[PDB]
Amino acid sequence: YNKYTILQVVPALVSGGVERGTIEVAKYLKILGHTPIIISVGGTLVKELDKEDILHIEMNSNSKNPFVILNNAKLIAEIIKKYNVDIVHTRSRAPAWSSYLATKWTNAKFLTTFHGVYNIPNSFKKYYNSIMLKGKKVVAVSNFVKQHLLENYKIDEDKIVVIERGVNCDYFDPANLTPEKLEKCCEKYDVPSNVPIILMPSRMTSWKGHLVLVEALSKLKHRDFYCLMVGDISRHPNFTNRVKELIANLKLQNKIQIFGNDSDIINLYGISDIIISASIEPEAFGRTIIEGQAMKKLVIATNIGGAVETINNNITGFHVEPNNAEALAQKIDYCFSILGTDLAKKIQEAARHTVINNFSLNLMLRKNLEIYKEILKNS
Ligand SMILES: [Cl-]
Ligand SMILES: [Cl-]
Ligand SMILES: [Cl-]
Numbered sequence: 001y002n003k004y005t006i007l008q009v010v011p012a013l014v015s016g017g018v019e020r021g022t023i024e025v026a027k028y029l030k031i032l033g034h035t036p037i038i039i040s041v042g043g044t045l046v047k048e049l050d051k052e053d054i055l056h057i058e059m060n061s062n063s064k065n066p067f068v069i070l071n072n073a074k075l076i077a078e079i080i081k082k083y084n085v086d087i088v089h090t091r092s093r094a095p096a097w098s099s100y101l102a103t104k105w106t107n108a109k110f111l112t113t114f115h116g117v118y119n120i121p122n123s124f125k126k127y128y129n130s131i132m133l134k135g136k137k138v139v140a141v142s143n144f145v146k147q148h149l150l151e152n153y154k155i156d157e158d159k160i161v162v163i164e165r166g167v168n169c170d171y172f173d174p175a176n177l178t179p180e181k182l183e184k185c186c187e188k189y190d191v192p193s194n195v196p197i198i199l200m201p202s203r204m205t206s207w208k209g210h211l212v213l214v215e216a217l218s219k220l221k222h223r224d225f226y227c228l229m230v231g232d233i234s235r236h237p238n239f240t241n242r243v244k245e246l247i248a249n250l251k252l253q254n255k256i257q258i259f260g261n262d263s264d265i266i267n268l269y270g271i272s273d274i275i276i277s278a279s280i281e282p283e284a285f286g287r288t289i290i291e292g293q294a295m296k297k298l299v300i301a302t303n304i305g306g307a308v309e310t311i312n313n314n315i316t317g318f319h320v321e322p323n324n325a326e327a328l329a330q331k332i333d334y335c336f337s338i339l340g341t342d343l344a345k346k347i348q349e350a351a352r353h354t355v356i357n358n359f360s361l362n363l364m365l366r367k368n369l370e371i372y373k374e375i376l377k378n379s
């Protein structure tokens with residue numbers, strides 16, 4: 001008929017919103033009457049999969065042992081035969097050895113999505129693109145990743161399909177903010193009343209740029225403001241104490257405060273006026289940029305990686321040079337001077353418009369189903 005079985009394989013390394021993409025695609029396939037299956041190593045992911053009632057198969061990946069690769073490939077192949085899987089969809093960092101073997105032996109098709117920029121040995125690039133990816137397609141989550149696949153992997157262009165990352169415009173919707181839930185968030189985060197709020201929703205790791213923003217906000221010690229740094233502070237705790245100290249030694253403890261991860265990030269966007277991505281090493285895509293644009297905010301992102309891909313400079317947001325405190329401090333100062341004006345409103349409106357028109361989760365999900373149909377054409 002027109003109903004498909006899509007088996008997604010998720011690895012232990014999940015940088016780049018890999019688990020979020022896998023769950024949203026599974027849920028979408030369910031609604032359309034398709035059958036999603038997810039093979040994972042287990043962990044916290046299974047909890048959501050059970051909530052959404054999606055068939056999950058635990059399995060232990062080990063790319064270091066050929067016997068395990070061959071035996072996992074057999075297990076997957078038997079899963080394929082069991083559920084008449086039409087496509088195996090891998091989102092692994094290295095080549096998905098076991099999954100590739102499973103599809104080579106069965107009628108299933110092989111789809112790869114690259115959620116980031118990783119390197120493969122130069123000796124392997126010829127074999128990968130010529131033999132392994134013959135008659136196959138690959139998905140890049142950004143044009144920044146697609147460029148890597150072209151210049152580094154030397155993968156043929158007509159193999160690469162870009163499916164930009166999407167933001168749930170139904171969840172990230174300023175029309176859902178209530179004046180009460182906002183006040184509760186200002187009360188939870190010690191937010192002052194009549195000052196601009198700067199939100200940096202970044203994991204507390206070194207390459208995110210926290211240090212650059214703190215040196216930038218020090219250059220604006222004369223302006224009144226309040227900066228919130230919300231994100232995990234556990235994976236790199238050594239770095240967190242380092243930042244909190246720099247804020248202290250610069251006597252900025254009352255204008256910048258660090259908080260653990262935010263349960264409901266939507267109310268934190270709603271209370272903010274300026275969102276910051278200050279990464280000094282490139283990112284495949286700037287999730288918080290798109291999320292901030294969806295919330296009708298003034299967005300400032302470093303011009304590096306895919307983080308500026310969603311920003312039409314001076315129209316839906318602003319670019320800054322990475323690792324440049326003065327350039328960042330001046331852009332933040334500029335936004336202060338236009339907050340409240342018709343221009344800010346224009347940019348803020350334009351920002352959510354461009355996310356609805358080009359970077360919605362809805363369009364991401366549909367682009368995934370299209371590439372499934374292309375892969376399954378002539379069957
Ligand atoms: Cl995806
Ligand atoms: Cl993107
Ligand atoms: Cl959406």
Ligand SMILES: [Cl-]
Nearest residue numbers: 015205235236
């Ligand atoms: Cl890391």
